[PDB]
Design an enzyme around this catalytic site. Structure first.
Site, PDB file in Angstrom:
ATOM      1  CG  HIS A   1       5.007  10.109  35.594  1.00  0.00           C
ATOM      2  ND1 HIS A   1       5.184   8.873  36.180  1.00  0.00           N
ATOM      3  CD2 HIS A   1       5.098  11.015  36.598  1.00  0.00           C
ATOM      4  CE1 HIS A   1       5.368   9.023  37.480  1.00  0.00           C
ATOM      5  NE2 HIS A   1       5.320  10.314  37.759  1.00  0.00           N
TER       6      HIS A   1
ATOM      7  CG  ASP B   1       5.511   5.799  34.683  1.00  0.00           C
ATOM      8  OD1 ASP B   1       6.152   6.554  33.924  1.00  0.00           O
ATOM      9  OD2 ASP B   1       5.057   6.176  35.783  1.00  0.00           O
TER      10      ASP B   1
ATOM     11  N   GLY C   1       6.178  13.782  43.898  1.00  0.00           N
ATOM     12  CA  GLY C   1       7.529  14.258  44.139  1.00  0.00           C
ATOM     13  C   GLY C   1       8.483  13.096  44.339  1.00  0.00           C
TER      14      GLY C   1
ATOM     15  CB  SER D   1       6.835  10.732  40.627  1.00  0.00           C
ATOM     16  OG  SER D   1       5.783  11.264  41.416  1.00  0.00           O
ATOM     17  N   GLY D   2       9.203   8.429  40.157  1.00  0.00           N
ATOM     18  CA  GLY D   2      10.427   8.112  39.445  1.00  0.00           C
ATOM     19  C   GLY D   2      11.503   7.523  40.338  1.00  0.00           C
TER      20      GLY D   2
HETATM   21  C1  LIG Z   1      -1.347  13.114  41.858  1.00  0.00           C
HETATM   22  C2  LIG Z   1      -0.889  12.019  40.898  1.00  0.00           C
HETATM   23  N1  LIG Z   1       0.278  11.335  41.438  1.00  0.00           N
HETATM   24  C3  LIG Z   1       0.084  10.484  42.402  1.00  0.00           C
HETATM   25  C4  LIG Z   1       1.123   9.710  43.055  1.00  0.00           C
HETATM   26  C5  LIG Z   1       0.758   8.832  44.079  1.00  0.00           C
HETATM   27  C6  LIG Z   1       1.708   8.062  44.734  1.00  0.00           C
HETATM   28  C7  LIG Z   1       1.327   7.186  45.813  1.00  0.00           C
HETATM   29  N2  LIG Z   1       0.185   7.383  46.456  1.00  0.00           N
HETATM   30  N3  LIG Z   1       2.123   6.184  46.159  1.00  0.00           N
HETATM   31  C8  LIG Z   1       3.034   8.169  44.362  1.00  0.00           C
HETATM   32  C9  LIG Z   1       3.409   9.025  43.360  1.00  0.00           C
HETATM   33  C10 LIG Z   1       2.471   9.803  42.693  1.00  0.00           C
HETATM   34  O1  LIG Z   1       2.959  10.605  41.728  1.00  0.00           O
HETATM   35  C11 LIG Z   1      -0.564  12.617  39.539  1.00  0.00           C
HETATM   36  O2  LIG Z   1       0.681  12.833  39.290  1.00  0.00           O
HETATM   37  O3  LIG Z   1      -1.489  12.860  38.760  1.00  0.00           O
HETATM   38 MG   LIG Z   2       2.171  11.855  40.439  1.00  0.00          MG
END
Ligand SMILES: C[C@H](NCc1cc(C(=N)N)ccc1O)C(=O)O
Ligand SMILES: [Mg+2]
Ligand SMILES: [Ca+2]
Length: 223
Positions: free
Chosen positions: A40, A84, A175, A177-178
């Site tokens: 993503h 993902d 943020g 993420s990844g």
């Molecule tokens: C807001 C949602 N992302 C949510 C999100 C949640 C978590 C977590 N709670 N561990 C970690 C990474 C993410 O990207 C989105 O990208 O739609």
């Molecule tokens: Mg997210």
């Protein structure tokens, strides 16, 4: 990272920042030319930044390298976030040293209760937006499959696992993420999703890397 701590400059050598004029996702260096991140996080014009701590200041040790190609898993489903995972090939090989090093891929899956290190430059607030300048760290355990599925009924696939705290207050966030989830020196997870951040009964969900080792190796070997 919510409820974490400052890692310390270059204490997480395999952590990378995906940049497109700003930090938008994390990633992990698995060898001199490849980075693993979340599907993503895909977008064109990605610059991989290695050896970073303060992402807003050039402090030294940084290496900025353009992505030559990004490979999103063919079966990635953007609705469910199943599969993902994404591989990024660097335009040029990174110079490996004590500040920039690769992380090993797992030979077997981790069990519930295993303690792992999660890191990133994601949001640090459960309620609101606050991005840090330096890398944040969080120690979190992998949760049992039963607790994970009870928390997210019908949304957890065999390619995901939950990690974190059911009491809330500590979690990865937007943020991050990844980014990496490293347990006992092995990359076991990729920060994927979750309901909000650090909410009780809503742990973070991560891509189960051990299910993709063969795919990663075969893909890297043919590219
Ligand atoms: C807001 C949602 N992302 C949510 C999100 C949640 C978590 C977590 N709670 N561990 C970690 C990474 C993410 O990207 C989105 O990208 O739609
Ligand atoms: Mg997210
Ligand atoms: Ca920097």
């Amino acid at each position: 990272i919510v409820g974490g701590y400052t890692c310390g400059a270059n204490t997480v050598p395999y952590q990378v920042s995906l940049n497109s004029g700003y930090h938008f996702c994390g990633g992990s260096l698995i060898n001199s030319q490849w980075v693993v991140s979340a599907a993503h996080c895909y977008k064109s014009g990605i610059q991989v930044r290695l050896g970073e701590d303060n992402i807003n200041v050039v402090e030294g040790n940084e290496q900025f390298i353009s992505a030559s190609k990004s490979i999103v898993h063919p079966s990635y489903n953007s609705n469910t976030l199943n599969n993902d995972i994404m591989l990024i090939k660097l335009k040029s090989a990174a110079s490996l040293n004590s500040r920039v090093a690769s992380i090993s891929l797992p030979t077997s899956c981790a069990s519930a209760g295993t303690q792992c290190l999660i890191s990133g430059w994601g949001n640090t607030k459960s309620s609101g937006t606050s991005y840090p300048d330096v890398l944040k760290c969080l120690k979190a355990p992998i949760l049992s499959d039963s607790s994970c599925k009870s928390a997210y009924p019908g949304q957890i696939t065999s390619n995901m696992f939950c990690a974190g705290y059911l009491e809330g207050g500590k979690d990865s966030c937007q943020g991050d993420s990844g980014g990496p989830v490293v347990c006992s020196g092995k990359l076991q997870g990729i920060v994927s999703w979750g309901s909000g951040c650090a909410q009780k009964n809503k742990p973070g969900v991560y891509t189960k890397v051990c299910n993709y080792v063969s795919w990663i190796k075969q893909t890297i070997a043919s590219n």
